[PDB]
Amino acid sequence: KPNAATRDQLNIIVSYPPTKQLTYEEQDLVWKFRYYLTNQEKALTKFLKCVNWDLPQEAKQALELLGKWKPMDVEDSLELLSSHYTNPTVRRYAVARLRQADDEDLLMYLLQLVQALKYENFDDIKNGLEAEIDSSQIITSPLPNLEQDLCTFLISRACKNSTLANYLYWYVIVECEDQDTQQRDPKTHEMYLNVMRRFSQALLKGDKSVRVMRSLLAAQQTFVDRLVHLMKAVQRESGNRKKKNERLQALLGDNEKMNLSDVELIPLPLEPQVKIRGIIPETATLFKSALMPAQLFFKTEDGGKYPVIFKHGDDLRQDQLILQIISLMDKLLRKENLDLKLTPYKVLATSTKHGFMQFIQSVPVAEVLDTEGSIQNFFRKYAPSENGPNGISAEVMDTYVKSCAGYCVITYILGVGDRHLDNLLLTKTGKLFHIDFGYILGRDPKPLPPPMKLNKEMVEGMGGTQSEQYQEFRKQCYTAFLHLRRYSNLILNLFSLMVDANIPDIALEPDKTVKKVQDKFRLDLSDEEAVHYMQSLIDESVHA
């Protein structure tokens, strides 16, 4: 039991980011008052970071306390599923606490949970079963407290929830198709195939509904396979954009050949809650871009049109991670009652070579300026209001201020590079948002880029630096920033699980990736120092 002075020193340690490396001096203090810290749920993660698991007595002593401790939070168990831990009892404990989460929260961490399998017992996975095997053909070729591992648990929940089933499927499918993994880590590629085999197996074993989930996934797999075959053809067609589009619509029209315009209701892999009847052949076109991506309009169950960007010949995993993080950041912000009107549009890689994107009706800021002159002109044209600020609907102005603040902070934390008016989009409802996340975590095609993604034209849109709207922008920025800092351990743990994913800007320096995010939070500052720090970044970016 420690004195009043020691307790403060322990508290400094317990409050540390999950990433920060514990000094020997710190390691010994935690090791000493380990029976004291038992009632501190947040200290358990700092305790298991002291232990040298290579030492049986130290490992054994550590596990006794793990049973005695105040049960860990769901957000903190993600720490135990990283590469830092190899102890089966620890990894089993993470899963045991992770089971406390509901499916909504699980989906939030699913991309990372799939990556965490890379640190699981590959043999234990293989035992669960009852180049040679093609992963894409597993589901399409059906054959006539601390007990569960990560693999068992995910599969278990995936069989009860169709939304999880879908993302579990496509996440694991993309891991299986990873060439770098096949080449450099064959035993990992072999694990993912076995995860996919265990999944197909568990679904086949299920009730009427679970057996249909498997056919649905096969239908989805088959549909994607045909859309790829159509894409390869369109990308190959000799001619101009008009020639390739006519080929695109011709093949989409040919339902007997291609089977893409009229299909039995199947969930959209991108967003499974949306079921689709097929693709409208006549509204399909390629974007001007040299990668030849297509704009395809899906026919939904209840009469809607769901536009997608389907890319073939590009890896969508970086963009996929960023949009799932923006979606998480938006969810925590909303949780803290701060809806900043963000566009966390869906992105799903259906392979390392292709994937889907949720298309949002929007206009690039560049176009807005080159057609209407200003953001305020655009807004007066589509949302005029006499009583409103600068002749614009207050709702639209409120949406504009909120989304600008939200994206300023989010793109600041994620170190989003290559920012230009062509990859900043506006909606007639006042929604501002970012697209194309090719450069993140401090990368940029140009050297020494600004830490904040602001400009003259963005502020002009609010009514300039002297407006009431400009004050509210600053207020929203530093409010959003304080909130996101409150979930720094959750964000940092999720990024901790992304180090061994083949995401270009993470692959570049895995060992230094999480510190890049950690440093943006400026956890060294108090919330008041943080609020002033955020104002300095905003002011400097605007004045420059």
Ligand X SMILES: C[C@@H]1COC[C@@H](C)N1c1cc(=O)n2c(n1)N(Cc1ccc(Cl)s1)[C@H](C(F)(F)F)CC2
Which C-beta is closer to ligand X: that of 260 or that of 357? Answer: 357
Structure tokens at 493: 């743990």
Q: Which of 176, 268, 279, 357 binds ligand X (CB under 6 A)?
A: 357
21, 498 contact by CB (below 8 A): no
CB of 319 to ligand X, least distance (A): 6
Cα→Cα distances 217→104, 114, 224, 346, Å: 21, 18, 11, 19
Which C-beta is closer to ligand X: that of 297 or that of 481? Answer: 297
Measured CA to CA, the distance from residue 306 to residue 266 in angstroms comes to: 14
DSSP 19-84: SSPPPHHHHHHHHHTTTTGGG-TTTHHHHTTT--TTSHHHHHHHHHHHHHS----HHHHHHHTSTT
Q: Is 359 in the site for ligand X (CB under 6 A)?
A: yes
Amino acid (1-letter code) at residue 135 = S
Measured CA to CA, the distance from residue 472 to residue 509 in angstroms comes to: 37
Which C-beta is closer to ligand X: that of 389 or that of 406? Answer: 406
Measured CA to CA, the distance from residue 270 to residue 308 in angstroms comes to: 9
Q: Is 31 in the site for ligand X (CB under 6 A)?
A: no
Site for ligand X in 100-159 (CB under 6 A): none
Amino acid (1-letter code) at residue 379 = F
CB of 350 to ligand X, least distance (A): 15
CB of 310 to ligand X, least distance (A): 9
Mapped onto helix, strand or coil, the DSSP state of residue 425 is strand
Q: Which range binds ligand X by CB under 6 A, 93-101, 287-295, 395-403, 466-474?
A: 287-295
CB of 293 to ligand X, least distance (A): 4
Which C-beta is closer to ligand X: that of 330 or that of 500? Answer: 330
CA-based diameter of the chain, in Å? 80
Q: Which of 112, 249, 362, 403 binds ligand X (CB under 6 A)?
A: 362
In angstroms, how far is the first alpha carbon of the chain from the final one? Answer: 55
Q: Is 345 in the site for ligand X (CB under 6 A)?
A: yes
Q: Is 291 in the site for ligand X (CB under 6 A)?
A: yes
Backbone angles phi, psi at 358, to 5 degrees: -80, 115
Which C-beta is closer to ligand X: that of 65 or that of 360? Answer: 360
CB of 438 to ligand X, least distance (A): 8
Which C-beta is closer to ligand X: that of 154 or that of 365? Answer: 365
Which C-beta is closer to ligand X: that of 314 or that of 539? Answer: 314
CB of 317 to ligand X, least distance (A): 13
Which C-beta is closer to ligand X: that of 252 or that of 357? Answer: 357
Among the listed residues 350, 196, 351, 161, the one whose alpha carbon sits nearest the alpha carbon of residue 270: 350
Q: Which of 269, 293, 355, 389 binds ligand X (CB under 6 A)?
A: 293
Measured CA to CA, the distance from residue 160 to residue 162 in angstroms comes to: 7
Which C-beta is closer to ligand X: that of 291 or that of 544? Answer: 291
276, 300 contact by CB (below 8 A): yes
Q: Is 18 in the site for ligand X (CB under 6 A)?
A: no
Instruction: Give the x/- contact pattern for ligand X in 450-489, rule: CB under 6 A.
Output: ----------------------------------------
Q: Which range binds ligand X by CB under 6 A, 52-60, 331-339, 357-365, 503-511?
A: 357-365
Q: How many residues does the chain have?
A: 544
Q: Which of 22, 204, 219, 360 binds ligand X (CB under 6 A)?
A: 360
Q: Is 352 in the site for ligand X (CB under 6 A)?
A: no
| Number of residues located near ligand X, criterion CB under 6 A | 16
Q: Which range binds ligand X by CB under 6 A, 127-135, 222-230, 284-292, 498-506?
A: 284-292
Structure tokens at 521: 């939070």
CB of 314 to ligand X, least distance (A): 8
Site for ligand X in 400-429 (CB under 6 A): 425
Centre a 10 Å sphere on the Cβ of residue 373 and count the other Cβ atoms it contains. Answer: 10
CB of 316 to ligand X, least distance (A): 9
Instruction: Give the x/- contact pattern for ligand X in 299-338, rule: CB under 6 A.
Output: ----------x---------x-------------------
CB of 106 to ligand X, least distance (A): 25
156, 203 contact by CB (below 8 A): no
Amino acid (1-letter code) at residue 171 = Y
CB of 367 to ligand X, least distance (A): 7
354, 309 contact by CB (below 8 A): no
Q: Which of 233, 274, 338, 435 binds ligand X (CB under 6 A)?
A: 435
Q: Is 35 in the site for ligand X (CB under 6 A)?
A: no
CB of 270 to ligand X, least distance (A): 10
Measured CA to CA, the distance from residue 303 to residue 204 in angstroms comes to: 32
170, 110 contact by CB (below 8 A): no
Residue 175 neighbours by CB under 8 Å, 6+ apart? 114, 117, 181, 192, 195
Amino acid (1-letter code) at residue 208 = K
Alpha-carbon dihedral angle through residues 209, 214, 218, 219, given to the nearest 10 degrees: 10
CB of 153 to ligand X, least distance (A): 32
Which C-beta is closer to ligand X: that of 121 or that of 423? Answer: 423
Q: Which residues pair with 268 in a beta bridge?
A: 271
Centre a 10 Å sphere on the Cβ of residue 71 and count the other Cβ atoms it contains. Answer: 11
Which C-beta is closer to ligand X: that of 160 or that of 242? Answer: 242
Among the listed residues 491, 488, 485, 496, the one whose alpha carbon sits nearest the alpha carbon of residue 80: 496
CB of 294 to ligand X, least distance (A): 9
Backbone angles phi, psi at 296, to 5 degrees: -120, 135
CB of 287 to ligand X, least distance (A): 3
Query: For binding to ligand X (CB under 6 A), which residues are involved?
Result: 287, 289, 291, 293, 309, 319, 345, 357-360, 362, 364, 425, 435-436
